[PDB]
Each structure stands twice: as C-alpha cells, then as structure tokens.
Design a protein around this ligand. Sequence first.
Ligand SMILES: Nc1ncnc2c1ncn2[C@@H]1O[C@H](COP(=O)(O)OP(=O)(O)OP(=O)(O)O)[C@@H](O)[C@H]1O
Ligand SMILES: Nc1ncnc2c1ncn2[C@@H]1O[C@H](COP(=O)(O)OP(=O)(O)OP(=O)(O)O)[C@@H](O)[C@H]1O
Ligand SMILES: Nc1ncnc2c1ncn2[C@@H]1O[C@H](COP(=O)(O)OP(=O)(O)OP(=O)(O)O)[C@@H](O)[C@H]1O
Ligand SMILES: Nc1ncnc2c1ncn2[C@@H]1O[C@H](COP(=O)(O)OP(=O)(O)OP(=O)(O)O)[C@@H](O)[C@H]1O
Ligand SMILES: Nc1ncnc2c1ncn2[C@@H]1O[C@H](COP(=O)(O)OP(=O)(O)O)[C@@H](O)[C@H]1O
Ligand SMILES: [Mg+2]
Ligand SMILES: [Mg+2]
Ligand SMILES: [Mg+2]
Ligand SMILES: [Mg+2]
Lengths: 379, 329, 379, 379, 274
Amino acid sequence: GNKLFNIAQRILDTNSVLLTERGDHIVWINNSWKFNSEEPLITKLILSIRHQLPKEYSSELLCPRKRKTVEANIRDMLVDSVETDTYPDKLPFKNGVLDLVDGMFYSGDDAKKYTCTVSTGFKFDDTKFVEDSPEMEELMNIINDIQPLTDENKKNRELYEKTLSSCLCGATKGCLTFFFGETATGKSTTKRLLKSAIGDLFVETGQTILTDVLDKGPNPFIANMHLKRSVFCSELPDFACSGSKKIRSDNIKKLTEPCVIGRPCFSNKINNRNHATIIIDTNYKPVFDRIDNALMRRIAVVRFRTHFSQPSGREAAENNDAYDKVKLLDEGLDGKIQNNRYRFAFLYLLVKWYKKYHIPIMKLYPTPEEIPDFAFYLK
Amino acid sequence: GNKLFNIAQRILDTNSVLLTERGDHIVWINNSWKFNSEEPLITKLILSIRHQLPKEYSSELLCPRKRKTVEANIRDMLVDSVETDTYPDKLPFKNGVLDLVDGMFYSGDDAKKYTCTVSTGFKFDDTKFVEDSPEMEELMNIINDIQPLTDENKKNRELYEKTLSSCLCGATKGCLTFFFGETATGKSTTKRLLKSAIGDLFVETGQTILFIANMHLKRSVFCSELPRSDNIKKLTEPCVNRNHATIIIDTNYKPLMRRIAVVRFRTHFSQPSGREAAENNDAYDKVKLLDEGLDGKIQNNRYRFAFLYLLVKWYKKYHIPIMKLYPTP
Amino acid sequence: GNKLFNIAQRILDTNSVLLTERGDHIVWINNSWKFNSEEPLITKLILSIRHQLPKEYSSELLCPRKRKTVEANIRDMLVDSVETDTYPDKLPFKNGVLDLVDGMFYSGDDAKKYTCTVSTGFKFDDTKFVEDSPEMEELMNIINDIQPLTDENKKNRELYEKTLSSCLCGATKGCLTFFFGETATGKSTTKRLLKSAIGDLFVETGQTILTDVLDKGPNPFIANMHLKRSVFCSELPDFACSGSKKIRSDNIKKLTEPCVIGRPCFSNKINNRNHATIIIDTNYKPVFDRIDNALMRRIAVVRFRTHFSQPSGREAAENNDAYDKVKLLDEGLDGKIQNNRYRFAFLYLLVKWYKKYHIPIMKLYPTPEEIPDFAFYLK
Amino acid sequence: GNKLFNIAQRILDTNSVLLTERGDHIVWINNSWKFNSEEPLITKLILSIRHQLPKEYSSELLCPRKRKTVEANIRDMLVDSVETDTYPDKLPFKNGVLDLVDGMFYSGDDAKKYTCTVSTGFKFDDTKFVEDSPEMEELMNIINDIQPLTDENKKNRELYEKTLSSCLCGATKGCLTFFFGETATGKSTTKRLLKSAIGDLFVETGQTILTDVLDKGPNPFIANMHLKRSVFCSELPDFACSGSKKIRSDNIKKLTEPCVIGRPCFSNKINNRNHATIIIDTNYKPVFDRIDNALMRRIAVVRFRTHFSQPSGREAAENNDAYDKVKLLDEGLDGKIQNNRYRFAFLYLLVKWYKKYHIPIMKLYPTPEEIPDFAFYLK
Amino acid sequence: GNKLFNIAQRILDTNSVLLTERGDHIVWINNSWKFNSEEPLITKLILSIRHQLPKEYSSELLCPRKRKTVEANIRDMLVDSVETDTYPDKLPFKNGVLDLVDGMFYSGDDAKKYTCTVSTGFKFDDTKFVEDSPEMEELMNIINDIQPLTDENKKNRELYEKTLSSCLCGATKGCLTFFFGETATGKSTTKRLLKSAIGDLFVMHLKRSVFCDNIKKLTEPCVRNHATIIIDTNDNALMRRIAVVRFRTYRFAFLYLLVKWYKKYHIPIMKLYP
Ligand SMILES: Nc1ncnc2c1ncn2[C@@H]1O[C@H](COP(=O)(O)OP(=O)(O)OP(=O)(O)O)[C@@H](O)[C@H]1O
Ligand SMILES: Nc1ncnc2c1ncn2[C@@H]1O[C@H](COP(=O)(O)OP(=O)(O)OP(=O)(O)O)[C@@H](O)[C@H]1O
Ligand SMILES: Nc1ncnc2c1ncn2[C@@H]1O[C@H](COP(=O)(O)OP(=O)(O)OP(=O)(O)O)[C@@H](O)[C@H]1O
Ligand SMILES: Nc1ncnc2c1ncn2[C@@H]1O[C@H](COP(=O)(O)OP(=O)(O)OP(=O)(O)O)[C@@H](O)[C@H]1O
Ligand SMILES: Nc1ncnc2c1ncn2[C@@H]1O[C@H](COP(=O)(O)OP(=O)(O)O)[C@@H](O)[C@H]1O
Ligand SMILES: [Mg+2]
Ligand SMILES: [Mg+2]
Ligand SMILES: [Mg+2]
Ligand SMILES: [Mg+2]
C-alpha cells in the first residue's frame, strides 16, 4: 500500500518515540530518552532504527527527502500523551538507568520502562563504581577533612550526608538547605564535587528567584530548573547593609511546592516539575522579611567549620572563634575536580549514603534550632 | 469530480471539525474535542477518520503531502462559527463526558453533542467511580480530619462542601473563596486532592491578578502565597476568555462585601515532638499526628476517583436546581 | 548503494565535524575548529573536503542542492556530544595550535587533537617568533619604560609579568587584577599591546558586570565572555561622588567561579565557561559595599608609575608624587600598535614570561596589603 | 565540470566579493565597497559582473534562479575573514577614493586596494574641485565672516580649521571639541556646511552619549557612530537649573578610545570602531561631575564671536560683550546650503586644511585654559 | 489567456473585496464585511463566490494550490484604498443595515453599499421589531420605574432620553454625560439593557458608546471617536462639555424605543447640549 507508512508503523510498534504532556516528542536512541524543542530528533531515530527493519525497509531510509515524510507520518500518529519521570528512585545515565535501592545497573530494554527524560549526561563506566580504589581513598580523606567525624560534629555531618544524598531521587523535596560557612571552608569544593558526580541533573541559578517577584515577565531561571534534581544558589550578600533586599518569605513556599510556576522566553508553559534540592551557598546569616510557622518548617542549615589555608596565613586562623580546624590548602585539588577524577567515587559514596537514610521513604526535616531569630521564635 | 475535495466534504459531513468564534479549529479524535492554537491538529484527524471512508478513498490518506491539501480544503470551508461549551452541568474526560444531574457517563457519539473543547485529560476508568472502596474510606477519614463535622463546624463544613463541589460546573460563578488558615491545616492537601480529582481543569497563577490568557474555559483557578478591590469585580464577570472557573486564594493571614466568601481551617497536623506546642494554641481546635506518607500517595493519584465521586455526590446536594455562591460577611 | 550517504559516512570517518554540548556543530577547515550558530558552516567543510574523496565522489560535490543533502545526512549522525576546550596550556591560532610548555607550533592533524574552538584570529608567521629583531628591541624598551626594572619596582614588575602572561592558559583564574595608576601612565598602551598580541581571545565589557546584578534579563556582557582568555573593564568612575554605586562584592566572587550564569539575547544558555583573566583598568582606588576575607583573597593590584608627557607640561609632572619617573611622550606609538608592529614580539615576550612562573601549576595570588581599607581590615 | 561552479570560481578570482570579520559580505559594484546585512547584495554583483565573463557564461546569469545558485556557492568559498578600513588618509566617495596626502583622485582597480566600507554617499564631480569659482569666493566670504582672520582670533581660527579638517581622516581622534557661542553666531551653519561636504560620514546624536550610562540595555546612538568620521551633538541645556544632570566624565574617557562599547537593537556586536571627531554644539559653558587631569587632555573648545542679526535688532547687539562683530543676516543663505551649493568648495577647503596640519602625524591637542573651572584646576 | 486571471477579474467585478487606508483587506461573506489582518480570509471568498461563476471557472476553484493564485492576483490588483463608515446614521446588524432616518431595514447588496465594519453582534429578528409585545410592556414599566415621567423630572427624563438616543448614530459626539446617582437605583441595569440592545458596538475605535485635557481629548473626531462617553458614578472650556442627569428611584423592543427616541430630537442634526 504505502511503504513509507508501513515503516512508520513498524517504528511506532517498538515504542521508541513517545509524546509527552508538555508537547515534546521524547526519542529513545543510544539508551537514553532525549528531547530538544528546536530540532525534530525523530529524524535521527529513523536513521538509528534503520538497522532493525527488513532489508527493503532499510535501504530507503538513507535519504533526507524520504526521512521527513516518515517523520511527518509519525508526528500524526502520536495522539495520546504519556506521563514521564514517575519513578523517583532512579538515576538515569547516558547509557542506562541505575536503581538506587539495590545498586544494580540497567541497560537497553530494561531501562526503557522507567521513562526518565533527563539524564546525568555521561556514560556509566562499570569498572569505576567500586568500593576500593585510590581515588575513593583520597576522596574519603577530602570529605573527612571538609566535615570532620567528631562527636560534637556528628549531627551536622549526618545532615550534610543526608542533604547531599537527597540529590539523587526525583521526589519533591519539602525543605531548603543552607550552606552557611566562613571563607575557604569547603562549600564550593562540595558544589563542584556534586556537579561532577550527578552531571546534567545539576543547575546553579541566581538569587533573583530567592528574593524577587518570580511571576512578572519571562524568567528562564525557573524554566531551566524543570526536572533538575539539584539546584544551587550563590549571590548571598549581607542584608545588614542599606539597599539590600531581604529574602522573600513567599518565594520559599513557592519553591517548595511540587509544580512551580514560571514561563520561559518565547513560550507559554508555566508549569515546571519540582524535583530540585535547593541549596543556598551562603556566607552570612540570612534574614527574611517576616518570620512565621510557614517558614520554620522549611529551613535546614549545615555548618562548615574546617578551614584550608596556606602556611603564611595559618597563624591568623587559629584564634578565630567561628573556626574549628585549620587544614593545609591543596593548590592542585581544584585542578583534579574538573578533570572528573572523583566522579564515580563520589557517585558511590552518594549511593551508599542514599541507601542509609532514604530507603523506606524520603523526607527532609527542618531544624531551626540553628538560626538566632528562629531560636528567639522558639522561646 | 475531485477526489481530494470529495474527501474534505465527507470529513466535514461527519461534523468532526468545527470552527470556534475564538478563531481556533477544534478536532474530534479519541472521543474528545481537542484544540491547540499552535499546531494543525486537523492533519491528525484526516488520518484517524481514514477507517471511515471507502477503500479507494482511504489508501490515498497515507501521504503527508496529500494530507495537507485536504486540510487546506477543510480550512477553506469552515466559514460559519459554532459556539462551544454551553452546557455547564457536564464534566469532560479524555474518553467521554459525565453528566452531573444524573451521574451517567456518556461516551462515543453521545459525547459529541456537548461541544466540550476542554477536558480533564485522563481516561474515565469505569471500575473506580464506586461508593464503597478502601481508598474511599481513607479519603473520607482524611476529609473528616481536615474539617470535622462538629456542631460548631457544620456551617463551615457546608460552605467548604459547596465551594469544593462548585469546581465541576462550566458556568460563571460570582463569588471568590478564601482559604484563610494557619500552617499545616490542609490547604495544599485540598488543592492537591482537587488536582488529582479534576485534572487539567486546574490552574494556579501569581498574586498579580489580585496568566489571564490561561484562565480560559478552565474550571478552577487558585492563587497561593498571599503576604485590589476592583480586581474582584473584574474577575467575577463572564468575559475576562470565558471566566467559567472559581477563584480560590491560599493565604495564611487575614486579608465587594457581597462577593467574598471565607472558609476556615482549624485542624493542625504535627509530629509527636511538637504536639504539645499546638495544644495550648487558640488557632487550632484539634491536633492530629502528621501523615508523612499521605503526600506520596497523592501524586500517584490513589484518591483520584474517590474524590471525584465525593465531588459528584457533593454537587448533587446544593447546585441541582441552580448554581450560586453566597458571600459570608 | 547510496553515494550521498557514503560521502557523509566518509566525512564522519575523518572526524572533521563534531557536535558540542552547547548544541554547536563545530567544523574543521584550514587548521582551525570554526563554529557559527547562525550559519551551517558544515556546508563549507562539505565543499572544502571535496579534494579528499575519490573522483566519482568529488565531482558530485559541486552543487548546493546536493551539498545541503549531505549536511542533512550528517546532522542525523551526530548523536553524541564531545567536550571541547579541555587542554589549558595551548594557544590556538587561525592556522594551528601553539604548545606553551615547549614553544612548539602544531598544525594539521596534530592540531586537531586539542579541540580549541576559540582561536586568536590571525595566522602564525614563523619568521617573526624570534628573539633578535628591531621590533623586539623597541618593544622591550617600551615595556621597560612602562614598568622599570628598579629595586623598589621589582615585586610589581614580576606581578605585572605574571598577570600579563596568565592571559594564555585556558584554566580558571580566581584573582582579579586592578590596573590602578594616574593619567598618561600606560594602562591603555598595555591593553592595546595585549589585544594586538592575543587577538580574538580578548574582550572588554562595561563596568555593569562589576557593580550590577548580572541576572535580571539578558546580559550580553556576561554572555560574550565564554572561553575568552582576557577581559578588560574600563570606565571605573570615582565612587567618592554622590549617587555612585559601589562595586558589588559578590560579583567578584562570581567572576572567579569556573562557570558563570548570564543569558544572551534570543537564546537560553545560562552556562558560560570562565577562562578569563579579569583586569580592571581604573584611575582611582576602588571601594566596595563590604570588605571581608572572602574578598581580600581574590584581589591583586599592580601599580603604574612612569608618566608620559609633552615638554610643555613636563615641569608640572616632575613635582607630582604620583609619578616616580617622567618620560617623553611618543606621538607615533599609538599608530604603530593598530598596525600590529609589536604583535609577535609581544607574543614571544608573553610566552617567555609564561614558561617562567606558570610551568608547574597556574595560580594567581592576591596582594591584600596594597589597598588602604584592606590594609585596615587585616589588623 | 560545472558551469555554475566555474562562474563562482571566476568571480572569486577577481576578489569582487569579500567576507568581513563582522559577518558581512561586502560587495564591490559601481567602484564602491557596499554591504547591507538584511539583503544579500551578492546577487547584484552576480549580475553586474555579467559583462566580464565569456559569452557562454554571461547570457546564463539573466535568471534569478541561477543567481541564487552562484550566490549559494560563493557564500561557501569564503572562509578567510578580512580586515577593513585600515588606511586613515583616504576619503571614500560613491564612485572612488580620494587620496588626501596628494589631493589626487582614484577610481577603479587602484581604488579597490583600500577596503573602505563606508562612503560619503555622493559622486565626486571632478570639474568642481577647483581653486577659483564664484561658489568658492562666497564660501570664503562666509567662513571669514564666521571666523574673522584678526590677530586676536588667530589661534581660535587655526583650531577651528584643524577641528573641521580632522573630519576626513579614519584614525581615532582622542579629544572632544566644543562649539561654544551665543545666539545666531554660526554653529548650525558650520554643521550644515560640514554635512553637505562629507555627507554620509557624519551623524548627529543626542546628549545621551554625553550624560547617561551608555551601558544599560540597547543604545542605537553608539551603534550608528561606527566608522563615522564626524559626530555632532547639539542641545546642551543649561545645567544651572534643577535636576539637570552633569556630563559624565567617564563617558568622555570612553568616547576617545579606539573601539567603543555599545550594543544595537536586534544584534549582539558590542565593539564599534571609533573613527569619529566628536563636536558638541553647545550654547552655555558646560560643567562636569568631577574634574581631574584625565579630563584636561581630552577637551578643546572654539569660540564663535560674529553675530548675525536683522537691522531691526541691530542696535541691541552692538553693546553686547558676547559679540565682537555684527554682520547682516542672509535670509537666502540657509536655502543655498541644503542645495549643496558649497559642497565641493568646502571639500577643497577641508583638504587644503588637511595638508596644512595633519600631514606628518594627525593629532588633536586640548585647550584646558579656556574654561574657568579647568583654569582653576590648572595649578 | 488565464482562467486564474479572469476569475480574479470577475471576483473584483462584483466588488466583494476592498482595501482600506489602514492596510486591511475587508472581505464580504455571510452578508457582513468581516475583516481581520491576521487571517487571510480572501481564500474563503474564492470558494464562497464559487457558486456564482461559470462551471468551467468554478470547477478549477476546488484546488488549494490554484486558490492562492487567484488570491495572489486579487491581492496585487487592489491599488486604490477605500474609506469606511461614512454614514453616521446607520446600524449594522449581522444580516443587514438598519437606516436610522426612517427605520427601514436593508439586507444583501443594498446592505453592501454601507461599508460598515463593526456590527452589533446579533442577528435581526424580523418579527420582533414591533410595537405591541408583552416584553415591551414589561420593559416600558421597568423604564418608568427607573425614571418616572413626572413634571419635576421632565427635564431630567428628557436629557436621559436624548443621552440614550445618542448611542445609536455613528457621528462624532462632543458632550460628556454623567450618571450621578446613589446605589440600588438602576444605572447598572440600564447599562445591561443597553448592552443587550446594541451589543458589540458598546464597550475604543469605531464604537458608539463608552461606559466608565482628557475631557477635550475624548471629544474630538480623531483620537475615530464615535462613542458617547458616560461615567457611572456614585474653566469655561470645561462647562461646555458636561451634562448631568440624576438617578433617584427585551432587546429589540429596547432598540425600537431607542429609535423612536432618536427620531424626536436628532432628525435634522445631532448635537448634545452641555
Ligand atoms: N580536603 C582538602 N584538603 C586540602 N585542600 C582542600 C580540601 N578541600 C578543599 N580544599 C581546597 O581548599 C580551598 C577551599 O576553597 P573553597 O572553594 O572550598 O572555599 P569557599 O568556602 O567556597 O570560599 P569563599 O568563602 O571565598 O566562597 C580550595 O582551594 C580547595 O581546593
Ligand atoms: N487528614 C490528615 N491526616 C494526617 N496528616 C494529614 C492529613 N491531611 C494532611 N496531612 C498532612 O499534613 C501536612 C500539612 O501540610 P499542608 O498541606 O496542610 O500545608 P499548608 O496548609 O499548605 O501549609 P502552610 O500554611 O505552612 O503554607 C500535609 O503535607 C500532609 O502530609
Ligand atoms: N614607552 C613609551 N614611550 C613613549 N611613549 C609612550 C610609552 N608608553 C606609552 N606612551 C604614550 O604615552 C601615552 C600614555 O597614555 P595611554 O594612551 O597609554 O593611556 P593612559 O595612561 O591609561 O591614560 P588615562 O589614564 O588618562 O586614561 C600615550 O600617548 C602612549 O602612546
Ligand atoms: N557669513 C554669513 N553672512 C550672513 N549671514 C550668515 C552668515 N553665516 C551665517 N549667516 C546666517 O545667520 C543666521 C545664524 O543662524 P545659525 O544657524 O548660525 O544660528 P545658531 O548659532 O545655530 O543659533 P542659536 O544658538 O540661536 O540656536 C542664519 O540665518 C545664517 O544663515
Ligand atoms: N426599576 C427597577 N426595575 C427592576 N429592577 C430593579 C429596578 N431598580 C432596581 N432594580 C434591581 O436592583 C438590583 C441592583 O440595582 P443596581 O443596578 O445595583 O443599582 P445601581 O444602578 O444604583 O447600582 C438590580 O439587579 C435590579 O434588578
Ligand atoms: Mg566559594
Ligand atoms: Mg501551602
Ligand atoms: Mg586609557
Ligand atoms: Mg543652532
């Protein structure tokens, strides 16, 4: 009858192409559900699936004139929407999906059932997600240095591990984490390690969403933070000075609900999924316009204490009261972070921490017995 | 005469395509009227209706270059506009239409008569719209926990009843409902339950209104995070876009007098650690242990059809003769 | 079986075309990776590679109707992304790549391995990169006039050399360098020499990035400093006047991060790589909103002392305390800089300085004692 | 092998089409490098060069469909970018290039070497560029009435000559000139004479470039003054009033740098070559925010003294100290300026002045002693 | 020659498509001059006029690729613009034009002559514009209740009648009218009755009634301003533009009485006293 239509029928039989409720056409090639709303990746798939059809159905796909007709057919046989990103406890890599509860790796058809559109962005090398390795040893030493495992720093350490490991599951976190710490303490190093670990599922935005009207006009910062598991926020200046705007109370509640509102540029989708762990890398005590019970149950704070300095300024940091330990700075560490030498080691550590506090359920608990004004509000 | 034109005339004979006064062409496929003013959904229909024309008129529709000629023809015959969404006592699902006065579910050609261009977005599973089911029991318990049926809170429960059941009719209401209450009282829980129930007929906007292009033919609009009297009057009018939705405001403090209704939340949910800190507070009348796993089984839509049946029974209790909302000064 | 497809397969074999994570299709023509998001530069490569295939596959390549079919076929085979600009110690010219650790010049296939998308913009002439030449002698005299090799000007000269030579490596710099100095001193001369030396890998922006929230709406100034290796910021108004806004302290923290957030116009990429050395051509001592140890470890200051003047006002400059030496102005010097007379000589000087302080590892230290308020804050 | 490709190769052999670093395909037709970055002017070339190819390659180019194939090919052989507007002592007319150092006119191939993208906009009539003509006599009378050749008005006349003549050279001038003078004195007359003389290479902007932040958002006033050789700025209001903001000094400092920073509408290029002589048609004494040494060496001023008035108000002008000689208003003069009666006469006068002060090296010197506050800052 | 050219010539012969000075291509289908410079409606007319041409010229209009050719020919054949809404005393209904000088109703080609772009929004039922109707009795009673016909309220009711009748003709009014009155009096009811009466042409270009230096910027021919401006509230150059009526205490019938009121004081000319 029509060969260019039977080809589309066969391609639709394998369920490689799907249409989501957002209007996009997610496509499954190279063991990853991919989407991009300026280029029809479907015409890629037609070529990639070419070596799966009968011989006479494959020699006709080597022509862009006959590979946009089949795309036109396929685009008119996708009438029903399919919901995506349902399973929260999955980590999607550019070549499969890893199950967190048991630490096994899926590939091919086994990874297709869990429709995870957003991926980490890098392949999952099997012979690096190991327990014993020199990189793992030095990473563990570095993490011990950043957060010492002492008795009075045990609750803080466990909260640090909980917050870091929470940036792996796609559930809607109900709390925001503050990263208060003084100069040269380890906040940015932890951020870079996390970014090299989880990859594409990690975005850092500005402080506009923290304190501004996140409703007027286009705001791509909210638009990019859709299905992103980890969100970081720098730009936390002191609010004790004149002219500095306080952190808006309603923004915290707006960022903690399971479907945030925000329109990108040249579009009208104002619904964005909220899988993000929102971490606010600050340097001073933050303040809010008003304090109420609607905020003391949404703030979690972890304190970084150990400091890294050169020997010249070593003696100037020993007497500081906000400082609990002065370690030696490593000038070459930041070089071997962007080189991704501690990528899979940190991934293994994060998975081990995840299957230690979030196995039954996931929930981040607030802890306001760490903010002075919140302490005043708590009698 | 002309095959590609007889095909278009036959497709227009079935009345599967109609032109709305808003300038958008509505499409009838999979037992639901859909529209999208950014794509020629019409070219979808011309393929689906392929199994309704004779064999010689069907093999010619497997060709995208020949499925835009007939689409152009169809677009050039739709001159007379036809009104849409005129029945207010109907609820459209992705696979049919449910009547509210009777509770009977219409599907197929019977669903085509009511031109409902909007829909909830999910298929109406038949063996879930039942009265007795464990999910219904636990949902009913949750609703009682949020709003107990005490002698003092009977009028408040009745007003909450009317307001929630009002999120089913396609007419224009004339009153704005507030959700004043303290923290951990169930406002967001009620919003999420209603999202699981009614689905797509649901939008939440910012505080600027107190965006507008999205509140067209929707049946429920909300605005949370409340930290203009003329806007209340501008919203309760039947042309803002058809204002067929009810407006609910999720606030925490105390925020024309004949257009505002307020329903209060008294129950407080807390962990055992902070239980004692809420017993002595006057803002709550009862404190119950917080359910950590309840939020998880909402996005799963475990209590979707249970709340839908509750809403239908709830509607056929106050709005059967007419629909109207009375302000509480 | 298909000539238009075999041509694309052969082109893909040579790895002349690659796809970057930024959605860009970089192209290898004339010993340089070129890219233009507004022009399918691929069709240039598709033509220029025409003298590499068999004769039957070459005469078919002289047709624009069959040269967009090959680019259509190629655009559906680039499914994976390739990371670009990873090697930090390389300098890309429009006809090759120069290795900094040895001074060797690489071209052809040896230049293809280091994927350096951004290049200087000019060819590398071999018979100019020499130590003995009149241009080199007069440039050395010029530089010794700008920064004399005295004993009190020894540390400043070394810091000046380090800062100037750092604008060759693609690493990230965590230190901002100011160019404080009085009028007619030679800041703009150094800027122009640097621009003539490195070419495209050099931009100058406004002072908004220093004192403004670079998040609100589009900000092309942040958007253009992507993979640039040197960024100058002139227009430093005196902040002692009323209504002048002080330098935003957190912008300094942002500019030293490995990746910055800023959106361009008519696009939606908020991730900009930061290879830039930020130099602030100022005329007065800068002030900030707040001073903290998180700022004093990011700032280094060089001093320009020698003054250039006409003989009419020479006596009025001898008694000034802001100049340690008065030299005779050269009217024609500003002419033979835009003529690129001192281009390869300054490039040789920069390379010679680079293989003197940045060979083991690159790092720019701060000099907090050179600022009055900073000097107050240590004690 | 392919006629449509050999035609493009032959066209590229004559170097009639070039690719600029700004992304524009400059075209060489009618002895003028023309470009327009909204319509591909190349096609005009493809037709105009039609009478230079063999006959078999000529009658074919009469079809618009063919000329899109040749243009599509030519767009694909231009990889090497070219620099433009390098020679400063050349004046480009719509039909050639005039050499300023000899007063000799070039047209044709010898005019192609100096790649000058911007032209005056009118043909150069050879039989008007003469010493003796009635128009020359009346223009000389007009100019001697505007600036009399007295002994006390000799330096001012020379500075007026130098400032006017500097609007012919393509180098970057480093000084700002004012046209201070009272009412009905001859400032707009000089502006209109200059506009009729140099034509396109002359723009007039507002005071935004002088007293405003030319960095926030789009600002076309800085995008039009790219490669323009003269920029007039009238409407300098009295700053003695309330709310009137002073002239920004850093604006002056940026207006005299080789490339100025400013973005246009619907584009992203920020750098524009500053070949402009900046003249401010002021009416009152200007004041700035802060006064320093960096502002002394960028400010020059000429004073207009002769007053033109009707005989009715002639008596009221004799006793005024702001005027040194009262002439009679010529009502018909303004009419015979927009008719370009004194176009080539003033062009010859400007060239004669150019070969009197700018032959060895072109430089604009300041006059800081002609302003009261500046004189106060002077010692 | 060309069939596709003679078709365009015939279509322009009937004067169905016209070009306006605003850059629009008004088109004539369903007995209404409907225009929209966002949707090229012209193609529809090429099909609509399809059953008016010879069959040889009509059987080639069943092709979209040969109906953008006729549209192209027509589009570059309309060189001279036309002006619209030149007859103030007309009322455009979706099925014709109602003359206001006498009250006769027109439809079709004779309705095509009046180039009115903005219609009332509803069709004109022929067997409702009658004097005797129970709904007309009810509306008359409602009007009497709102504005009693007393002697002390005769000037007030006369000015009320004139102000209401002004919102029927398309000329340029030059007097603002006030509705100063207390709550629960019937001003909003009057507005609703007026909106049901005249429909689309009551809401600000080509509109005939508006509800609410400005008093001068709202009383000049071009802002075109065809609307009587009335504000629903609770220098010598200013007194000559303000008229006040005080409030103290059924669509086609309302149109009928409006027409009768109009043909009582504005038959020679229209002008509203302050
Ligand atoms: N375990 C470690 N051992 C040695 N050096 C370390 C270790 N962890 C981090 N460092 C180094 O110590 C320095 C700490 O800088 P870091 O970016 O963590 O500070 P910060 O808290 O972000 O500072 P700022 O307040 O200025 O933002 C870096 O150079 C980092 O590479
Ligand atoms: N019937 C119930 N029984 C037990 N727990 C419940 C019940 N209803 C709700 N909860 C729990 O109580 C929690 C309180 O959150 P809730 O949705 O009431 O917040 P909210 O009113 O929006 O808060 P805020 O005022 O701080 O913005 C819910 O998240 C849910 O887990
Ligand atoms: N070594 C040198 N020998 C002679 N002349 C020099 C030398 N170095 C610079 N000059 C000249 O001295 C002047 C220095 O001014 P320059 O243009 O470099 O700006 P600057 O000193 O930063 O000015 P300002 O601070 O006032 O903006 C220029 O005219 C330059 O040509
Ligand atoms: N040499 C001359 N002889 C006679 N009349 C002249 C001569 N030069 C100029 N004029 C005339 O004198 C008048 C002066 O007008 P002009 O444009 O010079 O004023 P202006 O300085 O721009 O004005 P203002 O400062 O009042 O705004 C004009 O009518 C001009 O034509
Ligand atoms: N004369 C009347 N006839 C019928 N209904 C009336 C009359 N006067 C007032 N009403 C009723 O009063 C209600 C409110 O009147 P309203 O329009 O608010 O008065 P006002 O114009 O002073 O605001 C209306 O719904 C209307 O039905
Ligand atoms: Mg940091
Ligand atoms: Mg809430
Ligand atoms: Mg300078
Ligand atoms: Mg003037």
